[PDB]
Amino acid sequence: KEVKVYSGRHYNTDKEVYQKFQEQTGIKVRYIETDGKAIIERLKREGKNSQADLVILVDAAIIENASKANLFQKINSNFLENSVPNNLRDPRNKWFGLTRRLRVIISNPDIVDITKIKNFEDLTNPSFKGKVCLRNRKSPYNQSLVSNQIAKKGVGQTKIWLKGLISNVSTPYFSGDSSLIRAVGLGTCGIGIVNHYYVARMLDGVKGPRDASLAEKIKLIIPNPAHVNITAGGVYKYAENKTEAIKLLEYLASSEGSQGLANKTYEHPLKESSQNRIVSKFGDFTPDNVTIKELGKFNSKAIEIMKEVGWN
Ligand SMILES: [Fe+3]
């Protein structure tokens, strides 16, 4: 028996976890790891001829794209239904969260006054004019942040916030989070918005000594309440090895599988915060209770309004 996994978790750090499942169960795991959007396009084109069984995707936005493209089938699993928090699954049981990440504020204390920064709203403060730097709007991460703001506050108030934030940006938009972290730790940017785990990975040396140096200079700020995003897995609509796929998903979503995945990328497990010392030090967070499904719903509107204010 085998199962075929097409995984959007393109970190090059998950193979160990599939090995554990293989030993424990005997089920052979055949694993492709690449860009999520490349997987979506391939599956649409292959259809009933695809050899995917289990699909894993990063970020609410891409999960929404796969769901709109009808890539998942509904599954029944007493375990998943009763172990995965409602806010991090499909209310219609086509996908299930596996790891949690936070999009957070980073800062350089020698450029800006951190005592004035608590939440995202604070970044419209005109004293930060010239000092704010962002990754571009093509990142699903960014789109999902803005979607979060629309869920709670509605479209009107989000625009106000966006105009005020983009007013303070005087630097070309970045193409990655990692390079945004450099610019903050170097001091050419005062403030950035990045995912937590990139700061932790760089602190831990994963990208060599210079980046580790630049990362030590930053002050990470977790907004309260926090915006939470996920990686998620679902069973392919035409999966040949359906039984095996569910089982593997059941394992990835358990405490062992979830910790396994999360510990590789410095993310938080599904039901409890990370035990990693570097991640722990960022401090404790509280989820704002916006559901991953809501983040999907408003992804369209978010990109509309992002373009309208000038977030390129
Ligand atoms: Fe990422």
Report CA(178)–ligand 1 centroid distance (Å): 9
Same-domain pairing of 197 and 302: yes
SS3 state at 26? coil
CA angle 72, 267, 17 (to 5 degrees): 65
Same-domain pairing of 1 and 51: yes
Token pair for residue 195?
């995912």
Report CA(26)–ligand 1 centroid distance (Å): 31
Residue 279 · residue 60 · CB < 8 Å: no
Smallest Cα–Cα separation from 15: which of 230, 247, 265, 206? 265
Rounded CA separation 86/82 (Å):
9
Same-domain pairing of 70 and 218: no
Q: What is the DSSP string of 167-228?
A: TTB-SPPBS-HHHHHHHHHHTS-SEEEEEHHHHHHHHTTTT-HHHHHHHTT-EEE--SSBPE
Rounded CA separation 6/40 (Å):
10
Report CA(78)–ligand 1 centroid distance (Å): 30
Residue 147 · residue 60 · CB < 8 Å: yes
Alpha-helix residue ranges (DSSP H) falling in the chain: 15-25, 36-46, 60-68, 78-83, 140-166, 177-186, 196-203, 209-215, 242-253, 255-265, 277-280, 292-297, 299-309
Q: Which residues contact 292 (CB under 8 A, 6 or more apart)?
A: 60, 63, 87, 88, 89, 97, 229, 230, 232
Same-domain pairing of 221 and 258: no
Rounded CA separation 248/18 (Å):
9
Same-domain pairing of 288 and 140: yes
Smallest Cα–Cα separation from 152: which of 101, 90, 223? 223
Experimental technique: neutron
Same-domain pairing of 93 and 161: no
Domain count, the chain: 2
Report CA(127)–ligand 1 centroid distance (Å): 30
Token pair for residue 84?
């995965």
Rounded CA separation 294/195 (Å):
19
Same-domain pairing of 150 and 21: no
How many angstroms separate the Cα of 83 from the Cα of each of 67, 192, 255, 285?
22, 34, 9, 21
Chain centroid, CA 149 distance in Å: 16
Report CA(198)–ligand 1 centroid distance (Å): 7
Report CA(160)–ligand 1 centroid distance (Å): 28
Same-domain pairing of 127 and 183: yes
Same-domain pairing of 60 and 75: yes
Token pair 């009808």: residue? 70
Report CA(1)–ligand 1 centroid distance (Å): 32
Smallest Cα–Cα separation from 57: which of 3, 5, 4, 9? 9
Smallest Cα–Cα separation from 295: which of 227, 243, 220? 227
CA dihedral (303, 307, 311, 312) positive or negative: positive
Same-domain pairing of 122 and 166: yes
Q: Which residues contact 210 (CB under 8 A, 6 or more apart)?
A: none
Report CA(141)–ligand 1 centroid distance (Å): 8
Rounded CA separation 195/129 (Å):
23
Is residue 11 marked as binding?
Answer: yes
β pairing state of 191-195 and 28-33: unpaired
Same-domain pairing of 225 and 247: no
Range of the domain at 251: 1-101+230-276
Rounded CA separation 8/277 (Å):
26
Is residue 266 marked as binding?
Answer: no
DSSP structural state of residue 272: S
Same-domain pairing of 109 and 212: yes
Residue 22 · residue 28 · CB < 8 Å: yes
Report CA(16)–ligand 1 centroid distance (Å): 19
Residue 4 · residue 30 · CB < 8 Å: yes
